[model samples]
Target: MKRAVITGLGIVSSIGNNQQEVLASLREGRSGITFSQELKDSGMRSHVWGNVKLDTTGLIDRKVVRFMSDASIYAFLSMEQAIADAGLSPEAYQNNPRVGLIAGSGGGSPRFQVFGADAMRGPRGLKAVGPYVVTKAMASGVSACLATPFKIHGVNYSISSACATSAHCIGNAVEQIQLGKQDIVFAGGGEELCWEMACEFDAMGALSTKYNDTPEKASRTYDAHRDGFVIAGGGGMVVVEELEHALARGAHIYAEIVGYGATSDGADMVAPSGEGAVRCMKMAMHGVDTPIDYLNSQGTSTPVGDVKELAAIREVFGDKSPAISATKAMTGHSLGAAGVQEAIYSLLMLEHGFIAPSINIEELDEQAAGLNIVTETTDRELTTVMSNSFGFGGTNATLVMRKLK
Candidate 1:
């Protein structure tokens, strides 16, 4: 099997728009959660979210921007950054059959609810739905837009595994490369927060409703007072190339894709299963050649999800669960972007020789299972790390990363 290495990464999240900014935010333990007035009238239970405030007028062409949703905008921006950072020309790979794209996004269309509601109400509604409704709302739009921009005509598609989308996308990309189906692939995820979706989660009692005044303190992962997850919007992209291809191009190798694992709980769609989570981690470990040293958890801060994840960690890693941490505390839950964001964070930790803390964790929940959760900041040498992401419909995915050299 061919080895895969992450040559470049582009991230746009609540914390930052690029690598340096994100790394700096991580080091400083900055939290981006803030109150949004727009969400006030949206009827959401939680009014807080980590939203990106960067300007895209100068970054993207106006013509292209008109047709894109917030999710696609972030996806395109991150992909461009990743390609440029990898020192690869989009034109150069345009005709390469070995190069492809795979992306994931939760809320594909930002205008779905409004337009659909309008269409349902009256004759004028259909006109307001727009011509690009289907293209934008479908689960495959991210990869479609990405491939179009790069003129990529090879293997390309999008995965919609809810929050675990990016992890599954990246994991699939690795398999394609190892199977000699492709030489290089761009993979990750993006998300756009919509009021309707937010309201749905809120109404379902899946969001943190306690920190309306102090939004930053809302997403307290593993804390006894943790009520639920704070929703957020952002995206991230990564360039995955065969190790030899990256080395030949003198690419800035970030880390190697050592293992990929995925599983599904036969139980509930919204509720997570501890056994399924543990099985995914164990499967990833079986694929790797060495023991994991650190873990980036899918600690969404929901009481049930956090506790289930901890239980899985203990069951799989036993006494050596790896120094665990949750980036969601700072960035909020970016849904589809969570997997890629966590993956990027894990890679950065391995690259910079530091592990980020699970900020805002004041106390562990008594129901929380034991694990080496990184609460306070610490500096440590890390060689291997694993990131876990689980989504609705019982989908779970895990990726293991290790130093290439």
Candidate 2:
């Protein structure tokens, strides 16, 4: 198997626009959750989220914006940054069979709800649906859109595993490269938070409702007072290059992809199973001989999910689960983008020699009974780190990354 290394990273979150901004926000323990006026419906508790404040004026032209969704735009923007960071020339890989694109997204467009509601009302509203509805609304549109712009024609596809989509996509991309299928791949996830979907979560009683007045403090991961998760949206992209190919081009290697593991809880469709998560992590660690120095947990702040994740950690690392922290407290749950966003953050930590803290965790939950979460801001000499992402339908994925030495 060929070694895979991450050479470039691009992020669009509530904390910041790019990698540096994200790192600063993480180090400062900043929270992007803010009260949202657009989402005011029953069952919707959390009014705060990490939303990007961008106007389409300069970022994208008007003609192009008319056909693309916000999520697609975000995907394009993040990919542009990643490509520039990788220092890959457009002409060099324009016709290369080794280049490809793999993106994952949960929500494609916020306009879908609007179009659906309008169509149900009257025929006049049918025209409001737009001609490019299918192109813009499908979950795979982002990847397709990115491929054409960057001229990436090899094995292009979009992956969707709910919250674990991005992690799963990255894992699969690594496998393709390792199998000599592709030499370079751009992989990640993007999402657009819709008010209707936020209301749906509220209706399902899966969102935090107690922080209407204090939105920033709502996403309290592992905290005793934690109510639910904050629905945040963003986009993240990374340039995955074959180790030998990257070294030959003099590209800076961020981290090597050592192992990938994925599993499903077989028991529940929405709820998580601790044992399933444990199995996934154990599978990744099975082949690697290096000791895990840090763990980037998928602590979404939801009661059941948070506890299950900790339980899985305990099952895997036993008494050594204290070196783990949840970055969701800062960025909120970014749905499909959560996995890659956290992965990017983990890579940043490994490169800069610091571990991020789980913000708003005042007290540990009973579910976190035997787990030791890194709550305070601290620094560590991290070489090997494991990033975990669990999604709906009991899907779980884990990725192990090591320093490129």
Candidate 3:
């Protein structure tokens, strides 16, 4: 199997729009959650979101814009950033059978869906709807839109498994590289924050309603009074390539991806099971004797999810629990984008030798009492790191990474 290494990273989240900005935000423990008047006016229970701050005016070409939604735009921007960061020539990789692109989001564009629905329900009926609605609304469109512009001809597709969408995409990219199918792959996930998306989670009772005024405090992962996750929008991407390929190109290596584990709970919908999470983490850690120095957790601040995920962590690491932090406490949960976003954070911490704090956890949950929860930014030399992402439908993924020697 070929060793995979992350050579470049790109991110657009509520916390920051680029790698340096995000790293600074993480080090300072800044919270990106904010009050959303649109959500409030829509009558959604959760009125807060981790909204991306970038303007969308010139992000994509006008010709291609019609075929994309918010998530696709995000993926496009992220893919471009990753390409530049990795020093890959667009002319070289585009349509080059050796390169591939795999990314995903929770769904197509919720905002576009709302528009299509209105157009369909309007007096003009189908006449008002545009021809690109299907392309804009398909979950796979994010990857396709990116692949076309980037000219990546290999293994281009999107994976949708609720919040685990991006994790699955990244895991699959790792497999593609390991199987010798591709030398370089762009992988990650993107998501959009809109009232329509919020409505779904609000209806399912998955979003935080408390602290609407103090939105920053709403995403209280592992806190005693935690409520629910704060929905967010953004894109997170990494340029992963074979180690030899990266070294030959003189690409700056961030971390080596050593293991990936994926599993399903197979128990229920909307509810999470720790049993599957336990198994996946163990799988990713298989044969690795080096202790994981830090763990970027999937702590979404949901009352039920926080407890269950912590229990899963305890089951896996037990007494040797690593310094764990739920970055969703600051960035909120980026849904499908959470996996790659958190994985990027882990890589940053590994490169910089520091641990970001899991803010808003003033009072830890009794169930998470004994874990070494990171509540403040601490400078620690990190050798190995792990990231966890478990989503609805019991889909779970864990990635283990080590600092490049």
Candidate 4:
């Protein structure tokens, strides 16, 4: 198998937009969750969400922009940034079967799924349908929107596994490059969920309705006073390439992906299984020559999810549990995009030699007592980083990364 490394990063987060903004927010413990009037007026039980305040004005060509939804737009912007950062040109990927694309959007065609389908079958269905219905109604829309601009003809598709969507996208894309199937991949996820989506979770009692009065402190990952997760909208992207290819191009490398693991509880639809998570984590660390120094956890502030994750960590690391911290406490849970965002955060932590704090955590959960949950933003040297993404349906994905030497 070949070696894979991250060459460029493109992040669209609520706490921050670009790399500098995200890093500053992490160091300052900034909170992006806000009370959305839209969420409130939309009759949602919850009001807070992590929303990317994007100004799409003059961002893309008018001909193309009109056909894309917010999700595809977010992904497009990030992919453009990543390509520029990677210094990849059209000429670079000309006849390059190595340059593939893999996207994982937890929910695709959100607007279509939310209401457009009913409209499509209504009396106005015949004339109301736009020219881009095929592009805007499927899960592969992100990749389809990217293929033209990126000029990619290699392996390109969208992977969906609920919240584990993008984590699996990244991890599996790494394997594609490792197995010599492709040389590079635009790997990550996009999220542009609606308030109605939040309402869906709120209906199931999976959202933090307790923070309506206090949006900033609304999300509390692994806190005893936690209510539930805050739904967020954004996207994250990375330019993954063969290590040798990156080196030959003199690309700026962030970290090398070492191991990948994925597993299913095969047990529950909503409830998480700690045993499954343990197996997934162990699979990621198997044959890992470098032990992880830090971990980006997927603590969604849920009652059961947090406890199960902690139990899995305790089982895997025992005395050597790496410094763990959940960024969702600040970023809110970006749903499918959360894992990719954390992957970027983990690489950033490696670059800066710092572990970001688990913001809004006034008190820690007893399950995390002896674990190093990096409560305070500490500037500690970190060489290797591991991240976990456990989504609904008990699907789990893990990625292990080492700082590029």
Candidate 5:
């Protein structure tokens, strides 16, 4: 099997638009979550949001931008940044079978979905629906939008497993590179926040409602007062390459992907059993001998979910676990894009030599008592790191990476 390494990275997060900005936000424990009057207007219990405040004015060509939704736009921007960061020219991977793309969104485009439905019920009937609705609202739209413009010809598709979507995409990319199926693949996910999307979670009582007036303190991951998860919008991308390919091209390697593990609970549709997560973590660390220095946890802040994840972590790493932090405390839960988003955060911490603090943890949860929860930014030498992403439908994915020597 070939070795897989991350050569370049990009992000469209609420905390920051790029790597350096996000790094600063992480080190300083800044929170991107804020009050959303739109959520309130929509009669949602949760009035807070982790909205992307980026100005997309003239970011992409008008011709191409017309066909993209907000999520696709973010994915495209991140992909562009990653390509440039990797020092790759257009001629390098365009129409090349050795290059591929995999990306996804948990929900396709809820805004478009709602719009299409409203238009159908209007006086114009079906004629009111835009012709691009299908392309814009399908689960595979992000992948198509990204691959089509880039002229990527191999392994192009989207993986949708709720919050585990991007992690699964990245894990599959790792497998593709490891099996020598493709030398380079752009893997990640994008997600857009809309009232239509948040309404569903709000309907399910799955969104944070306790801190509507104080959004920054809403997403309390592993905190005793945590009520529920906060929905966020953004995208994250990574240029994953075969180790020899990256080295031959003199690409700046960020981290080597050591192991990937995915599993299903097969027990419940909306609840986790904790057993699967335990197995997933163990599988990701199966052959790695070095102890993990840091962990980017899923820690969605849901009442049941947080407890289950903590129990799983305790089961896998025992009493003295690695220094862990749930970035959702700052970035909110980006849903499908979360896996890759957190993965990028882990890689950044590994490269930059510091652990990002988990903010809003005023009182730690009892379930996390034995774990090493990082509540403050700490500088430390790191070698191995792990990221966990568990989503609805009881799906779980974990990735292990080690600093390149």
Candidate 6:
């Protein structure tokens, strides 16, 4: 496979809005988990979450606003930032077969709920359903919005793998470039949180409800008392370009994507499997001989997930365990966006040469005891880095990247 490099990044999380802010927040171990208005007066298990801070006013054309869903708005805004950071021009790659746009989103636009449920408020559900429901609710709408503005010449669509949505998007983009099909591709993930989404997780008993009083400290990834994930919302995107193409354009390369792995458990629906997680990580490290210096784990702070991930990490890198950190302790689980955010954060750590600490870990889980969990920020020269993301349906993905030397 040909080498792929990341030249640009865009992020909108609870901690910070942009790339620099997110990097700084990670260094300082900041937590964006908080009680949102949706969860304020409501009674739910997971009352806290990481809500992206954005001034939604004037984001897009005012007239075109209601036609789209909140996820589209979040993704479109994040794409704009990534494009600017990448210094891209539509005219430059308009007709080129070597470029494309792709994104990952968990629950597209459930905003249709309001219009559909508006029937209960004296409006007919079918009659109240607007013509924009499909465009607004479909998961691929994120990439479609990007393609419309940028004129991406290659495939422009989305892949949904639950929480691993964006990571798999990046992995597929890499395969395209590796196959010599495209020279560059923009890929990432996004999710829009709503009251209905919160209720679903709460019903599944998959959200953290132990620390409602201390929202910021509710997301304890590897802690022994960790209950479940603190569902969050945001977008994380990156510009993945062919290594030589980036160098020729004098793009500021952050890191090189060297390996990609995707696997399925075929075991369970909601509960995670330790063996499946281990296989995917090993597959991601396919031919990688270098010792990974850092690992961004898919530790969603769930009782079953943290334990499963730890066992997988132990089985894969056993004695040579990398400095692991579960950033969900701060950002909370961004659902489909988690994969892209974790990858981008891992790359940032490689670029800055530091290991981020897992915040909110008061007491480490017994199963995760021997792992090298970075409890505090540590400065380290990272050569190769790895990120893990496993979704609800037994879907798992792992990406291995390295410092651009």
Q: All models: lDDT?
A: 0.85, 0.83, 0.89, 0.86, 0.92, 0.85
Clashing pairs in 5: none
- The digit string of per-residue lDDT tens for model 1 on 259-280 reads 8899999899898988888889
Q: Of the candidates shown, which would achieve the greatest lDDT relative to the real structure? A: 5
Q: How many residue pairs clash in each candidate?
A: 0, 2, 1, 0, 0, 0
TM-score of each: 0.96, 0.95, 0.98, 0.97, 0.98, 0.95
Evaluated at residue 262, the lDDT of candidate 1 is 97
Across residues 282-390, which tens digit of lDDT does each residue of candidate 4 receive?
9999998888899998889998889999999999998888999899999998877887889999988999899899988888889997798887899998998999999
Better of 2 and 6 by lDDT: 6
**Which residue pairs clash in candidate 4?**
none
Kindly provide the TM-score of model 6 when superposed on the true structure, using C-alpha atoms: 0.95
Q: What CA RMSD would you report for each candidate?
A: 1.6, 1.8, 1.0, 1.3, 0.9, 1.7
Residue 383 error, candidate 3, Å:
1.3
Runs with alpha carbons beyond 4 Å of true place in candidate 3: none
Model 4 spans > 4 angstroms off: 121-123
lDDT of 4 at 77: 85
- Give one digit per residue, the lDDT tens place, for model 6 in 115-163: 5566546646556665667677676877876676666789788999998
Off by over 4 Å in 1: 119-126, 367-369
Q: Which residue pairs clash in candidate 1?
A: none
Better model by lDDT, 1 or 2? 1
